[PDB]
Amino acid sequence: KPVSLSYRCPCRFFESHVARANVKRLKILNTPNCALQIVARLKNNNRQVCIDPKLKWIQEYLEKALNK
């Protein structure tokens, strides 16, 4: 089993299935200690899942529009 119980990152899991249209709020936490951890709270599901940072829409939106 891949057991990585060593904390240098909050989001160990990432969902790439996140659609910006269904994202109520997201935030990319750029940890120098880890990498990009992003969170998506669904408008409909109301639940939050860590978003995969390599999603093209994520970086083009949160990183290019919000962050710039």
Side-chain angles (χ1 to χ4, degrees), residues 2 6 15 28-30 34 36 38 41 45 49-50 59 68:
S6 303
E15 186 177 284
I28 301 184
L29 183 62
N30 304 34
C34 187
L36 301 184
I38 314 176
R41 176 161 53 219
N45 189 28
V49 294
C50 298
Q59 56 188 210
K68 185 176 180 176

Side-chain angles (χ1 to χ4, degrees), residues 38-50:
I38 314 176
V39 297
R41 176 161 53 219
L42 305 198
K43 300 175 169 177
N44 178 31
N45 189 28
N46 178 268
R47 298 184 182 193
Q48 167 174 330
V49 294
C50 298

Side-chain angles (χ1 to χ4, degrees), residues 7-68:
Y7 286 83
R8 71 289 177 154
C9 311
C11 295
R12 188 185 307 152
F13 298 91
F14 293 109
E15 186 177 284
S16 53
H17 309 158
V18 182
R20 186 178 62 216
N22 185 31
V23 179
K24 189 172 185 184
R25 181 187 301 178
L26 73 161
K27 182 66 71 64
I28 301 184
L29 183 62
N30 304 34
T31 57
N33 55 272
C34 187
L36 301 184
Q37 291 68 211
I38 314 176
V39 297
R41 176 161 53 219
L42 305 198
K43 300 175 169 177
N44 178 31
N45 189 28
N46 178 268
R47 298 184 182 193
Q48 167 174 330
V49 294
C50 298
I51 318 178
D52 174 271
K54 45 66 179 175
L55 292 179
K56 193 295 186 303
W57 71 259
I58 279 290
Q59 56 188 210
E60 179 179 85
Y61 175 59
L62 218 293
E63 288 294 271
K64 181 61 177 299
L66 281 299
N67 195 326
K68 185 176 180 176

